[PDB]
Design a protein around this nucleic acid. Structure first.
Ligand SMILES: [Mg+2]
Lengths: 134, 144, 260, 53, 182
RNA sequence: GAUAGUGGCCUACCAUGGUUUCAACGGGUAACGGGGAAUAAGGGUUCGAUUCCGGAGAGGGAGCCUGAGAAACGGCUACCACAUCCAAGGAAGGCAGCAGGCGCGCAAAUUACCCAAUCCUAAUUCAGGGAGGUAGUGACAAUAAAUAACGAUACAGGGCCCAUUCGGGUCUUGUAAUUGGAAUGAGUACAAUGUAAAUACCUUAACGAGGAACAACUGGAGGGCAAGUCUGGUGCCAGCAGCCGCGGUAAUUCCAGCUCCAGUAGCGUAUAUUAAAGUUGUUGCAGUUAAAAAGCUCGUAGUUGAACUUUGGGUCUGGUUGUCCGG
């Protein structure tokens, strides 16, 4: 069945980001891709810390199951995770959300047009209305 | 006594000798005098493209004597004229003259092939089609 | 051209930074700083590559900005900083400190050190003159300069600099029978003693050097650097003693007690 | 001109649904077994091309 | 741009195109070996050829130089590891005459064969070629694999690939439900 | 004089002289230069447009400001070129930057998504970057192999028991064009991933192999050079064909078919260039006739040169080998 006994290798406990880094090996048995959130919860049992104190990513399997490899970061607390840990991973975890960045072409057009205008021109707008009215 | 000097201060005369006698084996001459680009209207072109003028057939040479299914083409990339061929019995009337054509060389390096007099080029692509298609009826010829 | 360079490919790097020939194609141009570029080590590279503490460029900038690293007490917020030679790099968090000491074969290696010796630096003499006011002063190719030097020290010697203020605690002259050290090219990175103070003037002083095991060789001068008295050099060099051993002894040592 | 004739006189025989030649690894196995098992029933020399005619 | 990636060819086309004795020899290698094609022969050949080049310029110099005493000993260590030569011949000079067939001796085609559970070697080709294996539990996929001479004892069947602790699978189950279960 | 400065760098006044047949500038380069690539006994011959290292260039040519730094070009000025909007009063421009189009060609793709990587930028961690990142167009080359495999049968020559003939003839192909389960990825798809978005794999729920099928291919089948006088048609025309030579009334070559024959997602064709070439030979050619000994000498330049000076005897050994029952 499933009944995995997870493990980590190459454990490093580094306060330079107030965290620990490890590589996670996971057992497949007879169940494909053990489903990140379950790994997160099992780690919550393992380090006995707060559940959200785990960001594990980068899984690959063994070409016919068996085990799978990932890299896992356990922040000592939510804080530094919130602060420096880049947005995207937290987005996908569901803790924090993902801003609407205006699409690449959108932002480019916007900034170029803003280039073309000198000073917030309320005056030029109403002046143009008046003049092209003539 | 092996009239090439051998004394242990030779290097200069050896080089000048060998590099004033490279000029025998023609391949060297063609590459360096380069006329393979000046003349030979297919400027080192493993192919070319041109247009048909009007089909002609020239008498062949010794014992093998027959009409040998000849064509007259003018290139486009420089504006020069040659005489080419059609293999694969039929398809000599896939011409539809004033249609363009894609030419390629033989294998005898501009020296003639087999029996034909003064001819250098097959044809494997033409007007967007390859003769292997129609003559095996894989594709179908669009008209120009 | 038409001015200097700011961008550095992943290739024209010196071998000794231990690159990876994959994972991107733009390697850190170390900041134009004290040492020479083509030998300098970049701190970011020191972290992601060897330490593997920061896992990403943003991680490096992150750990720097919050100021837990110090180049000899000094902060040096920047990434592309040129960390140098036998210097002191303090990580107050983790209560650990590092010394830029060479390994055997020729590339930079980690080494923890005792807090005691972490106090100071062991730098090379380059020049001594008198400037305006005729004041005496010394320039070390390890960046710093010191004004009012100890008087006797002529060119090409070793000065122990506190870095706590900018003051000398001792120095070593340049003689035969002096544990000496090299930073030179094809045989870079070897502990030694001067067996002969070969001169050959007119250009590029040369030194003949015995190892500890009587295996001599020759190096150009400037790339030599004295390191301590016989039987006692001041720094605490790593395992290896810069000997450039034989390949077969290496394989025997590597695979003798095979559990690794 | 008068060319384009042979295919006009040719018989227009059709293909024969013969069981597939087991293309691939089977092909090498078959050539081996056929060529190098049966040394008997010789044809003067082992003529590879014996016809029913 | 990116750090350049590199080539390496692994077969060559012999100068003589077509001469019988060869042709028959390789077909026979297939017969006692189960080859897919002749590419396996050319690759094993080119590998052999560079091995021989190595040994030739090894023995060209004098002896007792460290160059041989290191690289030759390491090369023969590699080979005695894979399983082509035999221990009684650790003299680097049988290496000049490996006689291509010998490499082929150690392919899981015939490695399974002479290990059995193969039953007319091409049935071993069936088993190995698609995922009906077990080697290191790294379930191999290409039988040009060169067992490391010690993991060979692990060679068995995985948790797929039934008769050895699996479930029938995707046809047999179809018919078991169709008739056996009913 | 100018230059951050040396200097015929420029100017004045004298000196008038450097250059080389161990190649001067000239002319061309289908050449930016090079670390390298192909080639495979050993020398060597050719390619270097570029993943690097530099160099030069951003219509072609002059001049300049700014700035530590530019003769810059996503900075500007200005001639002759390209030229983009009008109210006939100058007007924004320079894609050899990304992505597409334009004419041209033997011919090269998407007006893709992105700053998570990589790092780099300027007041700086956040902001910025068609630099580049993730995908599509991707048979320019590569590496790995899916193209079914095993059983119960009713046969031949020989494997094997003997001889008129139980077959104790048990393997084979010929072939059965008998017969059954076994097993799959090729393809389809929820899920976890996986790349932040985004390949795809990998796992993978489930579907999905029993013959047409989920269908191998291009070239040959006279000699190299691998297998045909087996069958039909055409018959000096057609067509073949790298060479030879097949074409003129049974083609063993054509046109088909069948049977065979190579490599296997690959193969042939086409051009340039390497081994074979010892037909560029320096290591390695020939020179009486065949591809030439200048008609003979002189005779500068290189190119080469007679022999002859410390032998020889003694020197302790410094270490190592043929080395000395083998620890
Ligand atoms: Mg299966």
């Amino acid at each position: 069945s499933d009944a995995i006994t997870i493990r980590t290798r190459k454990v490093i406990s580094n306060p330079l980001l107030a965290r620990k880094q490890f590589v996670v090996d996971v057992l497949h048995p007879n169940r494909a891709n053990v489903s990140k959130d379950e790994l997160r919860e099992k780690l919550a049992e393992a380090y006995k810390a707060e559940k959200d104190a785990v960001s594990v990513f980068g899984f690959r399997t063994q070409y016919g199951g068996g085990k799978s490899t990932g890299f896992g970061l356990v922040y000592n607390s939510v804080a530094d995770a919130k602060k420096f840990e880049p947005a995207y991973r937290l987005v996908r975890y569901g803790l924090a959300e993902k801003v609407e960045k205006a699409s690449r072409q959108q932002r480019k057009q916007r900034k170029n047009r803003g280039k073309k205008i000198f000073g917030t021109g309320k005056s030029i707008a109403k002046k143009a209305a008046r003049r092209n009215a003539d | 006594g092996k009239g090439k000097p051998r004394g242990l201060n030779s290097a200069r005369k050896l080089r000048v000798h060998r590099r004033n006698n490279r000029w025998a084996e023609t391949t060297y001459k063609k590459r360096l005098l380069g006329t393979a680009f000046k003349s030979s209207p297919f400027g080192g072109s493993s192919h070319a493209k041109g247009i048909v003028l009007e089909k002609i057939g020239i008498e062949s040479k010794q014992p093998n004597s027959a009409i040998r299914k000849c064509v007259r083409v003018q290139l486009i990339k420089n504006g020069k004229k040659v005489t080419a061929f059609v293999p694969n019995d039929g398809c000599l009337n896939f011409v539809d003259e004033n249609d363009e054509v894609l030419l390629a060389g033989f294998g005898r390096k501009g020296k003639a092939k087999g029996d034909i007099p003064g001819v250098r080029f097959k044809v494997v692509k033409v007007s967007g089609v390859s003769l292997l298609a129609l003559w095996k009826e894989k594709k179908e010829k669009p008209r120009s | 051209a038409r001015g200097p360079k700011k961008h550095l490919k992943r290739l024209a790097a010196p071998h000794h930074w231990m690159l990876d020939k994959l994972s991107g194609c733009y390697a850190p141009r170390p900041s134009a700083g004290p040492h020479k570029l083509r030998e300098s080590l970049p701190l970011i590279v020191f972290l992601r590559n060897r330490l593997k503490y920061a896992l990403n460029g943003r991680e490096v900038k992150a750990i720097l900005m919050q100021r837990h690293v110090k180049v000899d007490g000094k902060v040096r917020t920047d990434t592309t900083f040129p960390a140098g030679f036998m210097d002191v790099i303090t990580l107050e968090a983790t209560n650990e400190n590092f010394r830029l000491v060479y390994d055997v074969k020729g590339r930079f290696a980690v080494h923890r050190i005792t807090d005691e010796e972490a106090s100071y630096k062991l730098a090379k003499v380059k020049k001594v003159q008198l400037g305006k006011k005729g004041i005496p002063y010394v320039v070390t190719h390890d960046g710093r300069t010191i004004r009012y030097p100890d008087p006797n020290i002529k060119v090409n010697d070793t000065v122990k600099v506190d870095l706590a203020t900018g003051t000398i605690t001792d120095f070593i002259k340049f003689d035969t029978g002096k544990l000496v050290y090299v930073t030179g090219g094809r045989n870079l990175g070897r502990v030694g003693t001067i067996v002969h103070r070969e001169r050959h003037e007119g250009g590029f002083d040369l030194v003949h050097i015995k190892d500890s095991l009587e295996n001599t060789f020759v190096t150009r001068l400037n790339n030599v650097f004295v390191i301590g008295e016989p039987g006692r050099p001041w720094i605490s060099l790593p395992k290896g003693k810069g000997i450039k051993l034989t390949i077969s002894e290496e394989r025997d040592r590597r695979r003798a007690q095979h559990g690794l | 001109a008068r060319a384009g004739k042979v295919k006009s006189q040719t018989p227009k025989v059709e293909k024969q649904e013969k069981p597939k030649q087991p293309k691939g690894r089977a092909y090498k196995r078959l050539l081996y077994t056929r060529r190098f098992v049966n040394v008997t029933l010789t044809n003067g020399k082992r003529k590879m091309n014996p016809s029913p005619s | 741009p990116r750090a350049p990636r590199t080539y390496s060819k692994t077969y060559s086309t012999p100068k003589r195109p077509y001469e019988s004795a060869r042709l028959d020899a390789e077909l026979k290698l297939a017969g006692e070996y189960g080859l897919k094609n002749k590419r396996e022969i050319y690759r094993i050949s080119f590998q052999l050829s560079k091995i021989r080049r190595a040994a030739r310029d090894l023995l060209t110099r004098d002896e007792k130089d460290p160059k041989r005493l290191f690289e030759g000993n390491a090369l023969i260590r590699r080979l005695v590891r894979i399983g082509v030569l035999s221990e009684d011949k650790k003299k680097l000079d049988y290496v000049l005459a490996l006689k291509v067939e010998d490499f082929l001796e150690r392919r899981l085609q015939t490695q399974v064969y002479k290990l059995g559970l193969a039953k007319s070697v091409h049935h071993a080709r069936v088993l190995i070629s698609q995922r009906h294996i077990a080697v290191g539990k790294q379930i191999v996929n290409i039988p040009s694999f060169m067992v490391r001479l010690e993991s060979e004892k692990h060679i068995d069947f995985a948790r797929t690939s039934p008769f050895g602790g699996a479930r029938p699978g995707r046809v047999a189950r179809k018919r078991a439900a169709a008739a056996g279960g009913e």
